[PDB]
Design a binder for this molecule. Structure first.
Ligand SMILES: [Cl-]
Ligand SMILES: [Cl-]
Ligand SMILES: [Cl-]
Ligand SMILES: [Cl-]
Lengths: 245, 245
């Protein structure tokens, strides 16, 4: 008999919060065993059971996974399976599955989002290119956003996130466009504290932006975690059944 | 007794070739010590000598260093010192020191070069933004390169690398522009093998391109190493006392 495992991957809930929900079934567990593991920007849960064949183990792993997912809104945070899966891999597969293309305009991440897209073979089917608008002048110049408007609202704002996404979509005619603008830290920017990030998303149907706070993190961690927030926003939009793309 | 160390950092030569050039010196060196080390993209040599003062230690570390750098073309590959140092860090400091700004147009690296620039605090002083031209369509549209010529020469060509660098410099008004186009792999393109990368560099004085071969490497390593080749090209141009920028 071999040890079979299954890894559940979650984004949007901290490892300290998720296990408080779970401890009912962690303090009660038997077989499969449950083991949570946190990493930069996300958390996972390892289920482990003994069985003779992958079919038998899958059947027991499925029952405990159903218990976990239905708790609270964990279905909103669970995004995939696998020791190596990641939000960018899930989004890449989802983009190819739905025949959509994506572009981006990045400031503080400065290319990390689009570089993660190119990590996967065949990315050219879903990604044709994008923009790194690191200055206010290049946000205006590259994308065609009025310079005064950027100055008035600030580059760290929902307005600027929405405009970067809408204009980069219109310049590339990709199906979706992501924008990332915020404060890498540690200094505040425009009165916005370190870790404040606005992430825009634009399709032909709608343009919107989310505001996230990645507080208490290094420069590199804010940029890295902001990329995951952007990929998760794409994931939710593609999985939504609401004609969003 | 106190241990005093010095780390020499090299780019453009592999571990096998470096150790071969150093064979005679290493076989005859007892104090200071000599230890070569390698990782993806670069190689280092650590020298150790003991003394309870640096002027005594630095004097013999200096004589071992001179013997090393005078071997063959190792002066061409040596780029800096320090256990925690890097080629992007050295090039970043050089851009600040010389008061030069830089932009980029990236295809296969897809933003890794510009994302590496933003790793350093104050990157906004020397970097205002750039382009990710992942497709032949966006190479033409974003940079204004005549399409017929891109298809004629091929996207993996010195011609295309030169045009990408020249156009991105002219669109941003930056002092320098880097371009990266090549065969990420693992299977060939345009009859060129995987790892074939053309790297353009444009100033108002001159536009040129180099060709590098990163063969037998995975996609991610090709992109990672291509980024370093681009940084080294910037380094050599800024250090060249030849009216190149
Ligand atoms: Cl799994
Ligand atoms: Cl930003
Ligand atoms: Cl050193
Ligand atoms: Cl070599």
């Amino acid at each position: 008999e071999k040890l079979y495992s299954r890894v559940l991957r979650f984004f949007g809930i901290g490892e300290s919060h998720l296990v408080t929900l779970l401890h009912d079934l962690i303090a009660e567990q038997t077989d499969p065993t449950i083991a949570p593991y946190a990493k930069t920007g996300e958390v996972t849960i390892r289920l482990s059971t003994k069985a003779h064949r992958q079919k038998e183990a899958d059947s027991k792993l499925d029952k405990l996974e159903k218990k976990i997912i239905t708790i609270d809104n964990l279905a909103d945070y669970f995004y995939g399976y696998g020791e190596e899966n990641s939000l960018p891999q899930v989004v890449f597969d989802l983009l190819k599955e739905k025949g959509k293309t994506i572009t981006a305009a990045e400031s503080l991440t400065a290319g990390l989002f689009q570089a993660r897209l190119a990590d996967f073979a065949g990315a050219s089917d879903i990604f044709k290119g994008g923009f790194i608008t690191y200055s206010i002048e290049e946000k205006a110049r590259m994308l065609g956003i009025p310079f005064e408007d950027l100055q008035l609202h600030g580059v760290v704002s929902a307005f600027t996130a929405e405009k970067m996404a809408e204009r980069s979509r219109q310049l590339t005619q990709a199906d979706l466009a992501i924008s990332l603008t915020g404060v890498a830290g540690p200094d505040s920017l425009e009165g916005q504290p370190a870790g404040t990030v606005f992430i825009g998303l634009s399709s032909s149907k709608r343009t919107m932006a989310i505001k996230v706070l990645i507080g208490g993190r290094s420069r590199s961690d804010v940029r890295y975690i902001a990329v995951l927030h952007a990929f998760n926003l794409v994931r939710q939009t593609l999985l939504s059944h609401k004609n969003l793309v």
